[PDB]
RNA sequence: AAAAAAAAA
């Protein structure tokens, strides 16, 4: 019943957050990451439920809420990077509709299988065109491309590819 | 063109 809650806007605090995820059910308790010292936030935050069903329910409901201007991706508490390090089950989005956004992301994948992590990505002028979606599974993702890759999505052809980190890039 | 993230202070 633990949930990472990120992509805040550095001024987003526990308090707001409470206010967001409490009507979603009794709420443990509520921390937003900041800098040892500096107390600069760092764009995350836990949000602990009580009850597990609540917390799967604040993720399947106020998933992509906007908060002080930005789209909040909420996923299941993992501090294990290893998954996201080894992109395994990431793929790559290319020439995104702009009209599209990260639920229309989301539910346009979310066919292939449970997905850990999406995000389209944009900046002041909006869509910046493409965005990411880590699928829990490397078959899920398999399934993705192929299935995806080319096929017209609004008016739009798309480029659907594994991920490839900016090293290997 | 385009190639994310997470330090329980
Ligand atoms: N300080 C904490 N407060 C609340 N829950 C926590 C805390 N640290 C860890 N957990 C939870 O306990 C699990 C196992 O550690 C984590 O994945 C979280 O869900």
Same mark, same amino acid.
């Given at each position: 019943?633990?949930?990472?809650?990120?992509?805040?806007? %550095?001024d987003?605090?526990?308090?707001? =957050?409470?206010?967001?995820? +409490? %009507?979603?059910? %009794?709420? =443990?308790?509520?921390?937003?990451?900041?800098?040892?010292?500096?107390?600069?936030?760092?764009?995350?935050?836990?949000?602990?439920?009580?009850? %597990?069903?609540?917390?799967?329910?604040?993720?399947?409901?106020?998933?992509?809420?906007?908060?002080?201007?930005?789209?909040?991706?909420?996923?299941?508490?993992?501090?294990?990077?290893?998954?996201?390090?080894?992109?395994?089950?990431?793929?790559f989005?290319?020439? =995104?509709?702009?009209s599209?956004?990260?639920?229309?992301?989301?539910?346009?994948?979310?066919?292939? /299988?449970?997905?850990? +992590?999406?995000?389209?990505?944009?900046?002041?002028?909006?869509?910046?065109?493409? /965005?990411?979606?880590?699928?829990?599974?490397?078959?899920?993702?398999?399934?993705?491309?192929?299935?995806?890759? /080319?096929?017209? =999505?609004?008016?739009?052809?798309?480029?659907? /590819?594994?991920?490839? +980190?900016?090293?290997?890039?």
């Amino acid at each position: 019943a633990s949930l990472y809650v990120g992509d805040l806007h %550095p001024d987003v605090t526990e308090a707001m =957050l409470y206010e967001k995820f +409490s %009507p979603a059910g %009794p709420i =443990l308790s509520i921390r937003v990451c900041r800098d040892m010292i500096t107390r600069r936030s760092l764009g995350y935050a836990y949000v602990n439920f009580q009850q %597990p069903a609540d917390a799967e329910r604040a993720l399947d409901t106020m998933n992509f809420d906007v908060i002080k201007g930005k789209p909040v991706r909420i996923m299941w508490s993992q501090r294990d990077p290893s998954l996201r390090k080894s992109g395994v089950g990431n793929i790559f989005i290319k020439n =995104l509709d702009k009209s599209i956004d990260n639920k229309a992301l989301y539910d346009t994948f979310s066919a292939f /299988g449970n997905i850990l +992590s999406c995000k389209v990505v944009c900046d002041e002028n909006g869509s910046k065109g493409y /965005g990411f979606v880590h699928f829990e599974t490397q078959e899920a993702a398999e399934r993705a491309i192929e299935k995806m890759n /080319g096929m017209l =999505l609004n008016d739009r052809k798309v480029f659907v /590819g594994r991920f490839k +980190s900016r090293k290997e890039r």
